[PDB]
Amino acid sequence: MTEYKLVVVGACGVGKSALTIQLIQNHFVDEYDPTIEDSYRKQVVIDGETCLLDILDTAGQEEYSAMRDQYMRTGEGFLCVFAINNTKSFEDIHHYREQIKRVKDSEDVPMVLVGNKCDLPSRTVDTKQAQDLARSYGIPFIETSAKTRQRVEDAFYTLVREIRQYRLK
Numbered sequence: 415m416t417e418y419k420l421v422v423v424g425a426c427g428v429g430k431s432a433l434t435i436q437l438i439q440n441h442f443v444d445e446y447d448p449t450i451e452d453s454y455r456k457q458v459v460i461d462g463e464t465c466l467l468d469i470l471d472t473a474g475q476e477e478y479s480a481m482r483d484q485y486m487r488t489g490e491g492f493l494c495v496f497a498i499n500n501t502k503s504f505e506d507i508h509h510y511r512e513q514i515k516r517v518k519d520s521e522d523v524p525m526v527l528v529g530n531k532c533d534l535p536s537r538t539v540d541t542k543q544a545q546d547l548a549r550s551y552g553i554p555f556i557e558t559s560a561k562t563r564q565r566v567e568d569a570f571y572t573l574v575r576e577i578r579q580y581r582l583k
């Protein structure tokens with residue numbers, strides 16, 4: 415099958431692991447160990463194509479090294495996650511995109527911006543604000559809830575679609 419290497423990035427606590435485990439296992443994990451970084455695979459059919467998703471759930475220590483860069487560089491698309499009730503995690507998005515552009519050495523990298531925890535009532539980041547930022551980046555924006563599973567498949571499948579478009583260009 416066709417493999418897609420996805421990398422889930424974003425601040426501590428935004429829901430990277432919860433989103434990943436929701437997609438793979440269809441259940442919601444609270445308080446998942448923030449130090450554990452793993453890759454998860456799933457075979458899925460997206461727009462008629464059988465896909466093997468290989469999803470890196472980034473975690474643990476913020477590390478910069480030639481080795482780490484090399485590893486990140488193998489990522490084909492990046493799910494850039496913030497939490498809609500945490501403004502700092504949203505303003506961190508610039509940094510993550512900066513590092514992605516740096517290691518991929520391109521201003522064109524498949525990316526999807528994800529505003530997670532959209533089930534919560536105490537939003538601090540407006541949907542429109544994130545939409546406008548995503549538009550400036552030229553990437554899709556989707557709000558998700560790893561808790562209710564709202565748009566979780568949409569978020570990951572949108573990233574696959576972005577990678578497919580990049581490959582065809």
Ligand SMILES: *C[C@H](O)C(=O)N1CCN(c2nc(OC[C@@]34CCCN3C[C@H](F)C4)nc3c(F)c(-c4cccc5ccc(F)c(C#C)c45)ncc23)CC1
Nearest residue numbers: 423426427448472473474475476477486506509513514517
């Ligand atoms: C909670 C738990 O420890 C956790 O999940 N994480 C996630 C990974 N990790 C991390 N953080 C940051 O930015 C954190 C920030 C706050 C303190 C200082 N620092 C700078 C900003 F102010 C925000 N950044 C990165 C990071 F860039 C990378 C990484 C390293 C090398 C290259 C690349 C290339 C592309 C990438 F997408 C990433 C990513 C992610 C790269 N890695 C991990 C980071 C905090 C702990």
Ligand SMILES: Nc1nc2c(ncn2[C@@H]2O[C@H](COP(=O)(O)OP(=O)(O)O)[C@@H](O)[C@H]2O)c(=O)[nH]1
Nearest residue numbers: 426427428429430431432444445531559560561
């Ligand atoms: N209400 C709500 N809580 C979430 C959601 N996603 C993650 N969480 C909670 O936020 C905390 C951090 O999530 P986690 O997946 O560990 O974040 P990570 O550090 O980015 O991997 C956990 O307690 C989760 O239960 C969500 O969509 N809604």
Ligand SMILES: [Mg+2]
Nearest residue numbers: 430431448473
């Ligand atoms: Mg985690």
